[PDB]
Design a protein around this ligand. Structure first.
Ligand SMILES: [Fe+3]
Ligand SMILES: [Fe+3]
Ligand SMILES: [Fe+3]
Ligand SMILES: [Fe+3]
Lengths: 311, 311
């Protein structure tokens, strides 16, 4: 039945989801936000960047490294959403619209880690050797239910749109307008992605409320949890205001509203147990917001000095 | 039966394939082969690179762009080999050794496109904006039989080990010792990868000669073919001697020998038709080697001037 639900969605994925892609022709590329290496001005542009970035506080460097590590892990996030599927009909073989979306979306995502990685490299502010190791360990690390991937990615796209957006805003506040542009441009990609993925989940709730509710309850319980090295990234994002416990709870309420999870009808006893669990979470998580803030305020970079580069 | 063949191989994959991984601790990283951005010497090192790279012929620039485009497409090559599999036993849940290999191998591969991409960027010799577009189109483009991926990757790892190795050798010949090191270091990764993948195919031939032969015949016929923009990369690799029609044929003979495809026994009529087809290919491809060379010698960069950066 899940396979068939997915199959029956092809037309709507084509009509409603694929338009959320931005044409490659109209798309920014990392080179847009970097010193021009073909230009006689290259060295001077690189120097300006390094000057601009010497003004950035340490917390900010760390959050930005957090964001790049997350993005650079792209090969291990698109893998769940990869569907070994291809449709046969009178026009011949073609790719399922699900795969057309995943592939093009992966191509979008690929630019996010590259821009931040080359920008941080050029700044000199972080030790790119240690961070590349981290990333190799992380790709090396990398339940089969096919709704789960879609739900998780909805949440992740909204969280990452908000985090990159807030990083951008703080870069702007410090006068680092190129870094603000980078962070803001990524955020705008993520806002589109979040829109496509939320709509997919919406549609799954429409067509299979029982399956989707059980999957969402599983995801909230098991996978998607309130927002040592990753703990440290998390603490820094908390105290900077980029991505907080309050924002996590706010994302949960938005998703509950957007998908009308507290308004589902016709559920079994099992479905209602799952709906009750999910819908009761925001009240549970409000209570731990003020503790998240205190904990973040005590974090030291001393165990993490290895992240930093030139001062 | 293919699923079961794969399942029955877990112990041997663990004992024989996983040791071909290089520990992340002992591993090079892109930063190793790049100007040190944390150093007061950064600008000077970047200048040395740009000087070293001004000595590189155009054919060489193009082949190197070919290689990076190929590598940077990594998200669309690991996807077939991704297996949504996880083993349950008395120790709990664990990852199938197939997935442990794929993940760690993907983490290895991720460094290949990054090093070449940042090196080419810093050189100024190519227009990275146009090449990033190309790459986005290419990831966006990106039969389900599970032997096919393993066979294809065997061939691809041997081809890419030979191509990066020969690019390295030519960089060396021009005195560009850092670029030679990069190309040579990648080649050595690919030689390990090729060894792991050839051994997998070997084992598939041992355990299921009939299935593997039919898959190999399919791959030679359909997918793996004698070595406009990709045609142009191919022509340049031909005339430079980096990767030629003769080398393609040589890879086919090596694989036939390594896996003893001309020595399989107990095949059905169908199996023997497939074995005869494959084993007759090298004689067929020798005949078109001298034509590949002539064709490559007539290629113009004029339609491809968009690749180039500063002169
Ligand atoms: Fe992203
Ligand atoms: Fe995204
Ligand atoms: Fe490679
Ligand atoms: Fe490889």
């Amino acid at each position: 039945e899940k396979a068939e639900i997915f199959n029956s969605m092809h037309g709507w994925v084509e009509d409603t989801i694929l338009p959320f892609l931005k044409p490659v022709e109209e798309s920014w590329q990392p080179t847009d936000f970097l010193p021009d290496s073909t230009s006689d001005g290259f060295h001077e542009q690189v120097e300006e960047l390094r000057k601009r970035t010497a003004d950035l506080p340490d917390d900010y460097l760390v959050a930005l490294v957090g964001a790049m590590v997350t993005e650079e892990a792209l090969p291990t996030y698109q893998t769940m959403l990869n569907t070994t599927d291809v449709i046969y009909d009178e026009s011949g073989a073609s790719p399922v619209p699900w795969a057309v979306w995943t592939r093009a979306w992966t191509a979008e995502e690929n630019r996010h880690g590259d821009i931040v990685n080359k920008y941080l490299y050029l700044s000199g502010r972080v030790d790119m050797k240690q961070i590349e190791k981290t990333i190799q360990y992380l790709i090396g690390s990398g339940d089969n239910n096919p709704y789960l991937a879609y739900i998780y990615t909805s949440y992740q796209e909204r969280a990452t749109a908000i985090s990159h957006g807030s990083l951008g805003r703080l870069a702007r506040q410090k006068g680092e307008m190129k870094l603000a542009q980078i962070c803001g441009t990524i955020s705008a990609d993520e806002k589109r992605h979040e829109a496509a993925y939320s709509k997919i989940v919406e549609k799954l709730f429409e067509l299979d409320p029982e399956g989707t509710m059980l999957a969402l309850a599983y995801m909230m319980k098991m996978k998607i949890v309130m927002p040592d090295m990753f703990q440290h990234f998390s603490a820094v994002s908390q105290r900077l205001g980029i991505y907080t416990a309050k924002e996590y709870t706010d994302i949960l309420e938005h998703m509950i509203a957007r998908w009308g999870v507290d308004k589902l009808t016709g559920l079994s006893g099992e479905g209602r147990r799952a709906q009750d669990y999910v819908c009761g979470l925001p009240m549970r998580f409000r209570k731990v917001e003020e503790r998240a803030q205190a904990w973040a305020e005590n974090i030291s970079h001393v165990p993490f000095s290895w992240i930093f580069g030139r001062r």
